[PDB]
Design a protein around this ligand. Structure first.
Ligand SMILES: Cc1ccc(C(=O)NC2CC2)cc1-c1ccn2c(C(C)(C)C)nnc2c1
Length: 349
């Protein structure tokens, strides 16, 4: 009872997918893999199907395919994308060469819904509640998103949200360059490599996202890493002695110490007219010192989310074994591990 596969030409590439998936149509390539929307006739869901992609052409590609599949199989939370299905047209490990991952398709991304557009306060509470609820879960598994931004927040018509692309974060020097949304939401310590960083890199990005939902404008649209740092330091202040010490990169501590000291601005004068509770929570997320930033779990308990908070309905993850991250294997070994993961996949209920 291996399903029946059929073949389509799409992206100018062959898709070979089980007959359960019908009406495939492109919703974009990437480098990465191609994504298609599809109707899953078995679940009644609209789904996103990602074909990787030369998955085992280098060690870097093989480890990455294994990582993504492992991450997706782990995640079981309403506000985190998980795996609905994984499949290969291949019948043996020897023939194994393509992986397709299937995922709920919420509908759009947040970026395409909200940008240039200011949201109502109740709409903001809901979206950020769900981002922190799914981040509490991800972080509890010891996973860092590292690249949270509106384009990887999948949102449906009812403003319900799942987080995409956690744990992968492997951008080139060039995708991060100049006046680009790829960098606007990243934590200063990660943008400028100040230190080996914690999970609160992600709470900095929620803060950037939240401020943009409230105001309709990017919070730190820097034209480059240094311009963006200056936008940052102008709002939150230059570091103190105490943070300067923790900046293990000697090079970066020397640069930042060159800067004219500036105090933290008043967030109620930047976020004029906003819910005081929204402003308070922004001041707790946008703290420069990552050791002092609010965590997803503490933030969910904040008064801003009184309507939505239910401490009994904010679950945590079973633990995630990333011991494989510090293992060097050969192509065929990553590939065989990936295959074991493809074949033991048990669909959700
Ligand atoms: C198919 C797929 C596979 C894995 C991951 C993924 O997140 N992998 C990393 C966590 C390990 C994301 C998607 C995916 C891709 C685009 N999507 C959209 C658009 C088309 C609206 C952007 N909405 N939902 C999605 C979901």
């Amino acid at each position: 009872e291996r399903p029946t596969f059929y073949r389509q030409e799409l992206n100018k590439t062959i898709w070979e997918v089980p007959e359960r998936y019908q009406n495939l149509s492109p919703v974009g390539s990437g480098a990465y893999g191609s994504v298609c929307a599809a109707f899953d006739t078995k679940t009644g869901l609209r789904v996103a199907v990602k074909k990787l992609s030369r998955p085992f052409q280098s060690i870097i590609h093989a480890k990455r395919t294994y990582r993504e599949l492992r991450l997706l199989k782990h995640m079981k939370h309403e506000n985190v994308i998980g795996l609905l299905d994984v499949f290969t047209p291949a019948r043996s490990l020897e023939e194994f060469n393509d992986v397709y991952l299937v995922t709920h398709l919420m509908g759009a991304d947040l970026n395409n819904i909200v940008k240039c557009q200011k949201l109502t306060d109740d709409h903001v509470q809901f979206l950020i509640y769900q981002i922190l609820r799914g981040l509490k879960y991800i972080h509890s598994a010891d996973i860092i998103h590292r690249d949270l931004k509106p384009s990887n927040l999948a949102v449906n018509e009812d403003c319900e949200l799942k987080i995409l692309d956690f744990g992968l974060a492997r951008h080139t020097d060039d995708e991060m360059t100049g006046y680009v949304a790829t960098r606007w939401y990243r934590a200063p310590e990660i943008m400028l490599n100040w230190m080996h960083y914690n999970q609160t890199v992600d709470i900095w990005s929620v803060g950037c996202i939240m401020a943009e939902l409230l105001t309709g404008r990017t919070l730190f649209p820097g034209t480059d890493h240094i311009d963006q740092l200056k936008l940052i330091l102008r709002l939150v202040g230059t570091p103190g002695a105490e943070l300067l010490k923790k900046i293990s990169s000697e090079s970066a501590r020397n640069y930042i110490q060159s800067l004219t000291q500036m105090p933290k601005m008043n967030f109620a004068n930047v976020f004029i007219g906003a819910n005081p509770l929204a402003v308070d929570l922004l001041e707790k997320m946008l703290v420069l010192d990552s050791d002092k930033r609010i965590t997803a779990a503490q933030a969910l308990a904040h008064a801003y989310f009184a309507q939505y908070h239910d401490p009994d309905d904010e679950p945590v993850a079973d633990p995630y074994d990333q011991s494989f991250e510090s293992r060097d294997l050969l192509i065929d070994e990553w590939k065989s591990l990936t295959y074991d993961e493809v074949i033991s996949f048990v669909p959700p209920p």
